């Protein structure tokens, strides 16, 4: 049986403050710009995931003003997350995405008559604004996400080229720079949409993942996430019709065949342009301190291994600025005289407040932990369990301080904690 | 270590009221009108910042009804801000901005077929309403803002004319008459948009700044801002496509080249017309007293140097009235018979309530202060630290009064303070 | 120093109820209809001000059931407003306004290409809905408003015909039948817009005033308004461009001249069609009793001179009904067979609750009052100070009654007053 | 003086439950369908009034389980309404109304140029959604409404055919099946709009009434309504211009005559298409029990005469379903093969909870009542005072029961009443 950390982890009055200070990300909203070689301008979209891997200093080395606090022979130290605040700079705004060649055939919302039939290539320049999403979740382990990917066909009828691919719910570790569901669902467009032209550039070549809350919530121990705030909204702006043969035509029993032009049923493969309504300060999730006092799982904010993963998604600041430089500052206004570009920006400032804890390594405690996270013990005395994955490394080792009243969150803390 | 002002600044029961009374600004919403020489009609936009430099009378001179209150040999007097109310006249409304030659090529929200390709100069007359914004912040030092400016290239490949300029987060002192982010982000359009036609006239030639909250909040002492109320909202009205060569074309791996007309991929440099929903009294920020009782920083409203900076931004009253005078009052309706103009207006009435404080200049106090703000001491016995900057000077020297019940805010005060 | 009425006005337990009962206004929404002589059908718009001059009976004559209550030799009687309720009939709805010849040249929200240039007279039939506004304020003096009018040029360069007129903030007494700001600001269109075609008929020939709250609030005594509820909301529906020469062209430094058609910069004199969102009962201001127990000013509801001014603005019931009568009831449907008309309606029912008060005329009281309102004394023992002004006279002399439980507001009162 | 029923009507602990059970109305939304003779398919619109005449059993006959409760010689029994719940079936939705030949000339919201002039008959097929309205009011007397009807001209200038009719505020008894104000105001379109084509079919031939709250509220006794919940909302969808001669042209002083096409001023008789925003459960009024504990009037829910009138208006369930039957089930899709129809539906279930009361008929009580409602006495020992009027008769005589816990409202009651 799993037990609440509150049962084998002694707490103290030692609190420290830590902040990563200003963090900037600056790139192209839709795709990375590599000079036909290496990546120079990285892809930085507002609809991207931000998974910060916050590294804390190992207290079992740290030099305290006191040292009579315990027996380094029978007990060990651990950092526990007391509260955090995800600072967010830059003004509020929405980000436009599009595709020069979107597979958007006919507008079905309100269309006059049964026009002709599409020939070859009817793609058109389309642009819209994605679904608004604000979310944040802390844990001592990377977050889990879900998306739909191409499955594996069994020993069945040879899949004639063009058959609808098999859907599979894939679970994975949400990494930094991953794409958020934008309104076309959480799926791997790269693999399920061969034409590379069914959704905006910023996602038509990757995967859009969605937090696998239900799975994490059932985590036996609860290291994945012991806190989370989600806020997503969206409505249907326009109604479209795709171009291309209809893999699965409309059944006869469902319609009354028409004559003349109508004799050729139109594409019944509908789609809609998503859109988030307005964004406002009132609904702002971040820039507000969150005090975790009682996790819903068994791990009550214990940063095992001196690690701490903070996932963040914020589209409320997705303005994609545009800038152009001239190349012929003289002719009378000539479009060719200029080069237009796309640049997006992200501004963070992660600040936390941790509390020193101890653990007397009794026979039984040693056992429970070894079954829970053998790593934890093996360290209290190597390779990275997530070396392949990519997270925004945030090193906070030389960033701790017990002078709480010297920092905004610290001040807020003392205040809130009454004493 | 920085200490809370509440530890070395004694408070009293002496309260005074002060108000700047009616303040008017009247000009042209988009640009200043100089008669080809000097500036006559100033630029007064609703989307402009209002940084009032409120000057208070030096209490260490002031003539009180009493004078036994202290020893002018060991202690000094300081004004502390207790509360204020930013009066706002004129009705509610929104302000239209535009550009006769905006670089708005094709509407991408919903466009028919793959039109032709732009030639030279396709600019069109466009008009929209900006992002709604209400904010206010007090401090004993000017506020800090952020915007993106043209950076400095290192000893790298010669920047071929037309290359995308380098972005740099510039920090600066928000001055009166500065531009607020309107939906196209906080950047210096003058420098990043060479064509001078990518955004409305009221901002295509200047900088749009955004409060650098995170930086001010981390102010070691906290003189920048000890109070602030922000409220911004906005949505995407229309989706546009710019004209001009695409500095960074869409990568091959992201699309399936098309033949015929489609063979020439369209501009994938999207943009959107911003818009603030409705404005209503319910969301009104101003015309309401704000009682600062416990600043979040260490400076609890102490107006060091007898100064006080009040920043204000209010677009809820940005109606840009129009007026026309005739030149041929007789002909049968002829457009040429009239000259149309643009005029905007702002109406303020800053009223405050200050509390007299004292400070015994002990050895240690003298030290702390000298490190904090040497100026403060050097005065208690010159050039302006912000002579170059421009603020709306509000002189309140002959405006103080201890007859609280004779003024609206005063009345409100007594009431609120129970006694 | 001004003193609170609560200091020299004794209160009693005598309360009376009074109501004006049903009040109807029925006319034309845009202009009055005079048969080329006298005014028959008056102008009754929803966006009109309603300033009721409520006349009360002079208690210093009134015949009470008791009369031992005081010495008519040393003290006088005064009515104090305890509470009121502005009854409003007719259903909720919005009112359409328009102009057959509005100076609306090109729609700038989204316009294709640089069309040609306007010739002479391009005015078009336009119609929209104004900014929603609900407000109400009581006082013993008429309300003050503000609007922009044509100023007076000093001894300067001869104002060449057509120069932009000089703006002046004019303060005035808001009279019944005045126009409310509708979204084009508070100004005197008659004088600032020579072409008579820049805004709807209901306002293109008059002034739109806005309550001068700030000025009234600073009223030394506070007889102007001791209570007020305001609720206004609005958004930008469409974006227009005016026709007529541009008095102040766009500065060269702000744009890159274009060649060809673009060589002639379009009118940069933008405007927007206002609109109030939906109206709903939830936001209804009226038909709810308001109990004034502690005025924000010094006059706590004392109806000096037995007068009482109640200003009201309510556009939530501005439906402009249409009706047509036939002239050839037989022909096969022929437009000429009918005459269409426009009629608006207003339905009020002002009910109050007053409290008898007394004032011993001591030497000092006599003085204070004589300085405050000499009239008040001169009466306690003539011409109208507002004879020229026009208010909706509401006589309540024969309308008082001490049988509170016999009237809805009375019942509400007893209830609310607990006893 | 009128006295509160609570003074002469003794209450008891006897409570009963009653419900009308399922009530269905099924017909045509716009007009009744009579087979050129008698009415078969009745008109059942969502924007119709529902005035239920709930008949209760006369307790002065009723057979109780007890009978020692009083002296049938000196006192009488009366039913008092304690609480009710208006059950509503069918899903939420809006109802479309229209007119094949609506007098809608030119769209004035945004129209290009000064088009030509209308000839004869320009009516067009128009369709929209009405203003949303939810209301409910109980009383022991039918509700009062108001609408504008054709008045009566005095001994004045012979009303030349076509002159604007005279408006009169007509008060009447709101009957079942009456029309609710839908956005074109409360008036008698049949009489004020001769062309029969100015508003949708469902109202162009009848009257739209609005509750005369103010009048009922002033009811000396208060039998009209001792409870009421109103909730109406609406916004302006489109702006129209009517066709037909302008009875009262625009005054010269208001405009600058134009000179070519413009020389003929267009119709300045504007109108707007109304619309209710979305409907949602959150704003649902019904399907919630209402406990009347203290009426605002003097009659605290005393069902004099064993009658009870319940008025209801609910447009939140106005979906107008469509259905078609074939007539040539074989040909290759041919419109003529089918007949389309219109059918609306209403589902109610009125449930109440009454409380037995008594009244000792003392000399004085007999008097008060005789003056109040002589009928009441004459019965305690004939023709219908509203025989001509039409209400939805709801007989609850055999529907009473003292087994409260056997019914939903009963259960809710016991719960709510704590005991």
Short mmCIF file of C-alpha atoms in Angstrom, two decimals, chain A residues 22 24 26 28 30-33 41 87-94 96-101 104 107 121-129 194-197 201 204-205 237-238 240 277-282 287 317 319 321-327 329 333-336 338-343 345 347-349 351 405-406 408 411, chain B residues 1-2 103 108-112 114 119-123 131 146 148 161-165 167 169 171 181 183 185-187 192-195 198 210 212 214-215 217 230-237 239 241-251 253-259 262 265-272 277 296-298:
data_model
loop_
_atom_site.label_atom_id
_atom_site.label_comp_id
_atom_site.label_asym_id
_atom_site.label_seq_id
_atom_site.Cartn_x
_atom_site.Cartn_y
_atom_site.Cartn_z
CA UNK A 22 14.40 36.67 -16.43
CA UNK A 24 13.77 34.85 -22.75
CA UNK A 26 13.05 34.49 -29.20
CA UNK A 28 10.10 32.17 -35.44
CA UNK A 30 5.98 28.65 -37.26
CA UNK A 31 9.23 26.91 -38.02
CA UNK A 32 12.90 27.02 -37.15
CA UNK A 33 15.25 28.91 -39.46
CA UNK A 41 16.64 30.88 -35.27
CA UNK A 87 6.25 35.37 -13.73
CA UNK A 88 5.13 36.42 -17.20
CA UNK A 89 6.32 39.49 -19.08
CA UNK A 90 5.24 40.93 -22.44
CA UNK A 91 1.70 42.29 -23.06
CA UNK A 92 -1.47 40.25 -23.69
CA UNK A 93 -2.40 39.30 -27.24
CA UNK A 94 -3.27 36.55 -29.72
CA UNK A 96 -2.04 34.28 -35.89
CA UNK A 97 -1.22 31.04 -37.65
CA UNK A 98 -1.87 30.08 -41.22
CA UNK A 99 -0.81 28.15 -44.30
CA UNK A 100 -0.14 29.42 -47.81
CA UNK A 101 -1.63 26.22 -49.23
CA UNK A 104 -9.69 24.45 -47.70
CA UNK A 107 -16.91 27.38 -47.39
CA UNK A 121 -4.90 21.55 -56.18
CA UNK A 122 -7.36 24.13 -54.83
CA UNK A 123 -5.39 24.96 -51.72
CA UNK A 124 -5.69 28.56 -50.58
CA UNK A 125 -3.98 31.01 -48.23
CA UNK A 126 -5.76 30.79 -44.92
CA UNK A 127 -5.12 32.33 -41.52
CA UNK A 128 -6.74 32.08 -38.13
CA UNK A 129 -6.27 32.28 -34.38
CA UNK A 194 -0.06 13.00 -45.72
CA UNK A 195 -0.83 16.06 -47.85
CA UNK A 196 1.04 18.27 -45.38
CA UNK A 197 -1.61 20.91 -46.01
CA UNK A 201 2.46 25.37 -40.64
CA UNK A 204 1.20 20.36 -39.82
CA UNK A 205 4.62 18.77 -39.32
CA UNK A 237 -15.26 30.71 -36.48
CA UNK A 238 -15.70 29.24 -39.97
CA UNK A 240 -14.84 24.39 -44.31
CA UNK A 277 -12.58 34.70 -27.73
CA UNK A 278 -10.93 37.68 -26.12
CA UNK A 279 -8.13 37.37 -23.65
CA UNK A 280 -8.28 39.52 -20.56
CA UNK A 281 -6.42 40.14 -17.36
CA UNK A 282 -9.38 38.95 -15.38
CA UNK A 287 1.64 36.16 -12.09
CA UNK A 317 0.72 36.43 -24.80
CA UNK A 319 1.33 38.17 -30.34
CA UNK A 321 5.16 40.60 -34.23
CA UNK A 322 6.21 41.44 -37.77
CA UNK A 323 9.22 43.45 -38.86
CA UNK A 324 10.68 44.43 -42.20
CA UNK A 325 14.05 45.76 -43.35
CA UNK A 326 14.54 47.60 -46.61
CA UNK A 327 16.86 46.66 -49.47
CA UNK A 329 15.61 52.65 -49.68
CA UNK A 333 7.33 52.69 -52.82
CA UNK A 334 8.11 49.27 -54.21
CA UNK A 335 7.17 46.09 -52.38
CA UNK A 336 10.34 44.38 -53.64
CA UNK A 338 11.51 45.15 -48.44
CA UNK A 339 11.79 41.82 -46.65
CA UNK A 340 9.11 40.97 -44.11
CA UNK A 341 9.78 38.60 -41.19
CA UNK A 342 8.05 36.82 -38.30
CA UNK A 343 9.28 36.80 -34.70
CA UNK A 345 8.76 36.17 -27.89
CA UNK A 347 9.34 36.14 -21.14
CA UNK A 348 9.41 34.15 -17.93
CA UNK A 349 10.58 34.47 -14.32
CA UNK A 351 10.23 31.96 -8.52
CA UNK A 405 11.79 39.28 3.15
CA UNK A 406 14.25 40.23 0.43
CA UNK A 408 8.59 39.48 -3.66
CA UNK A 411 7.40 38.76 1.26
CA UNK B 1 19.67 43.60 3.81
CA UNK B 2 16.84 45.97 2.85
CA UNK B 103 0.65 47.15 -46.02
CA UNK B 108 -6.71 35.35 -45.32
CA UNK B 109 -9.66 34.74 -43.00
CA UNK B 110 -11.80 33.60 -45.90
CA UNK B 111 -10.49 34.12 -49.42
CA UNK B 112 -11.67 32.49 -52.61
CA UNK B 114 -5.33 31.71 -55.53
CA UNK B 119 3.04 43.93 -58.13
CA UNK B 120 4.42 47.05 -56.56
CA UNK B 121 2.55 48.93 -53.85
CA UNK B 122 -0.77 47.34 -52.89
CA UNK B 123 -1.22 49.33 -49.70
CA UNK B 131 -6.73 46.71 -27.66
CA UNK B 146 9.92 47.24 -22.02
CA UNK B 148 11.74 45.39 -28.52
CA UNK B 161 20.89 44.66 -46.73
CA UNK B 162 17.44 43.29 -45.93
CA UNK B 163 18.40 40.64 -43.39
CA UNK B 164 16.07 40.32 -40.41
CA UNK B 165 17.25 42.77 -37.75
CA UNK B 167 15.82 41.78 -31.49
CA UNK B 169 14.69 43.72 -25.02
CA UNK B 171 14.34 48.69 -20.71
CA UNK B 181 0.91 48.33 -26.69
CA UNK B 183 -2.21 44.75 -30.28
CA UNK B 185 3.12 44.13 -29.53
CA UNK B 186 5.51 46.39 -27.66
CA UNK B 187 8.23 47.24 -30.14
CA UNK B 192 11.86 47.43 -37.07
CA UNK B 193 9.41 48.38 -39.80
CA UNK B 194 11.25 50.22 -42.54
CA UNK B 195 8.29 50.59 -44.91
CA UNK B 198 2.83 48.10 -41.39
CA UNK B 210 4.79 47.66 -21.87
CA UNK B 212 8.17 46.00 -16.95
CA UNK B 214 8.61 41.73 -13.27
CA UNK B 215 11.62 44.02 -13.16
CA UNK B 217 8.58 44.02 -8.70
CA UNK B 230 -3.99 46.47 -14.71
CA UNK B 231 -6.89 45.47 -16.95
CA UNK B 232 -6.34 44.66 -20.64
CA UNK B 233 -8.53 42.74 -23.11
CA UNK B 234 -8.59 42.09 -26.84
CA UNK B 235 -9.63 39.71 -29.64
CA UNK B 236 -8.73 39.05 -33.30
CA UNK B 237 -11.06 40.92 -35.65
CA UNK B 239 -6.67 38.18 -40.59
CA UNK B 241 -1.28 38.94 -45.18
CA UNK B 242 1.59 41.35 -45.73
CA UNK B 243 3.10 42.40 -49.07
CA UNK B 244 6.85 42.29 -49.68
CA UNK B 245 9.39 39.52 -50.21
CA UNK B 246 9.35 36.73 -47.60
CA UNK B 247 12.73 36.98 -45.91
CA UNK B 248 12.47 33.39 -44.69
CA UNK B 249 10.48 31.17 -47.10
CA UNK B 250 8.55 28.13 -45.96
CA UNK B 251 10.87 25.10 -45.70
CA UNK B 253 9.88 19.64 -45.68
CA UNK B 254 6.73 21.43 -44.60
CA UNK B 255 4.81 21.52 -47.87
CA UNK B 256 3.93 19.69 -51.07
CA UNK B 257 4.79 22.04 -53.91
CA UNK B 258 1.89 22.83 -56.17
CA UNK B 259 1.78 23.22 -59.93
CA UNK B 262 -0.05 27.42 -56.88
CA UNK B 265 3.68 29.97 -52.56
CA UNK B 266 1.87 33.04 -51.15
CA UNK B 267 3.06 35.31 -48.36
CA UNK B 268 2.90 33.28 -45.18
CA UNK B 269 3.56 36.40 -43.11
CA UNK B 270 0.24 36.71 -41.31
CA UNK B 271 -1.17 39.45 -39.10
CA UNK B 272 -4.48 40.24 -37.44
CA UNK B 277 -14.71 44.24 -26.99
CA UNK B 296 3.95 44.85 -1.41
CA UNK B 297 7.45 46.30 -1.47
CA UNK B 298 9.54 47.74 1.35
#
